[model samples]
Target: QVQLQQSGAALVRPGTSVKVSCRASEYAFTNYVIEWVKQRPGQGLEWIGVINPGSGGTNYNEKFKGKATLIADKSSSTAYMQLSSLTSDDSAVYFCARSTYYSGALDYWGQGTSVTVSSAKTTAPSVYPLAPVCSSVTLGCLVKGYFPEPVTLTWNSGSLSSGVHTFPAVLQSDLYTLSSSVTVTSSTWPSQSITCNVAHPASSTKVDKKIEP
Candidate 1:
């Protein structure tokens, strides 16, 4: 029943700083340590640090020595991370995890807080279709260069829903990119038209890319 409610997304200037919070509930927050992890767009997880709420003790990774500061408020059962000297490289999703003293396994995780650092305005998404494979033509749709996220990419007017794979959006320098794929047998692909449908809310755009039969 333990839950960690994380802060919402943030978009800030390059030189400004951002603080994300994770409020713990349904557990004794002071008994366990809270761990913070960093995940850059399209990158793997990197351990940033940990904080003990009761004693105010902290431990940080070498790389995040000055980049991230971990803090906790026992009264509110909330953990906070103050990221400073923001840059394009610092734009990523920060996740707060809880690990028990005995097990040392991160059992509970927060819905990551996304921090985007840039001075640019919102951009529309563009779709690019990748070449098809041989045996089973797995058509791929690469949607790139969008801001303020919340985009949807569907396959063929939502006719065939199965075998469709849509990945999470990955933040680039100042925009976001994602890819979706659908599998079709080579024999069926040549006889039917398949399309990638993209809906970007920020720009009110709907783009459709189709493959000829």
Candidate 2:
């Protein structure tokens, strides 16, 4: 199994830029391609792009141009992604992912590293805490993002109407990104369903996942 470990949290001001990293273990780093993902606060995941650590070539989500960059380091088995000109809207959890191909779905991923953007320099407490144990009282959902815009996280019962949820951010390597997760805890689990969804700012097609409890 491959394990991707990402770096810590970051705070950036509007118009500024920040770089985050991710490190990989237990696998041949060059054998697989790396990808970056973004998850805005209360939103879903978006795919930013893909990079080949062995070749250094990359393909980015068109909307990420001028905003995100993906790069890799073969010798160290690490990947990285840098976000520039960040705004409050840019605040979210970032993650690094690994896959057999540069364009397919991810197989293994790192826990997210969060980045917050604000006019004032202050750190916000983590949105949610990891459960002490995985039992019927706790539920988790993982989501990914690619680019272009507007992703949202929701539940199958329709949308999360109440309760506490947590989202974490992470970086994969020196230049790749990662995903974000949404967790909900309640006395009684909702009856409908849980989903992670992505919506382009204007497109009609929505990318989502529905989990059955």
Candidate 3:
């Protein structure tokens, strides 16, 4: 049972490079070659390249020729891949696989390593109040041009939980956008001080927008 422990996920900015490592154990590392594969959630596996730990030789897929570099440390039985000049297109989960034959099937694989390449900036959400309808007030929060997913929307002090409606993040160009809404009942809508709070993981500052009565 060959075991390969891959490095953890990485969050890097565009134009920068990221290196992922895979340390192999319980097997003779020099006897076999190590292959690296890339996979996006909606796509199939993409063979990036292979590295020969014994001689430090390498072969890369034409698509990843300049973008991916493979290396190995014979002493530590570790394999490494460095991805350069990254962008959102390079964001994916990469796997290090062991193959007895360089061009043959892979025998074992490491836990995938996630690589996310984006801007270092985190954009604030633009919260707006949708017009009231049917005696119920609906508040809308539009989060646009943000990096990395997961922005929370809350009403008043805490999450509404009851009438909260949120959508998944949509990627446009290189940024992410999301839309969410909270509906307040007529009984609690009269001159109430309502607010939409946005919490982004990148920063400690929370964007709070007040709803007009």
**How close is each model in CA RMSD to the real structure?**
6.1, 14.6, 7.0
Q: Where does the lowest 10-residue lDDT sum fall in candidate 1? A: 129-138
Error of 1 at 41 (Å): 4.8
Q: Which residue pairs clash within candidate 3?
A: none
Query: What are the runs in model 2 whose C-alpha is more than 4 Å off?
Result: 40-43, 123-213
* Cα RMSD for predicted model 2: 14.6
- lDDT (10s digit) by residue, model 3, range 99-171: 9854678989999887888775656555555545447667777777776555667777584677888888888
- The full ranking of all candidates by lDDT, starting with the best, is 1, 3, 2
Q: Between candidates 2 and 3, which one is better according to TM-score?
A: 3
Highest TM-score against the true fold, candidate: 1
* Candidate number of the best lDDT: 1
Q: What is the lDDT of candidate 1?
A: 0.86
lDDT of each: 0.86, 0.65, 0.81
Q: List candidate 3 segments past 4 Å from native.
A: 120-213
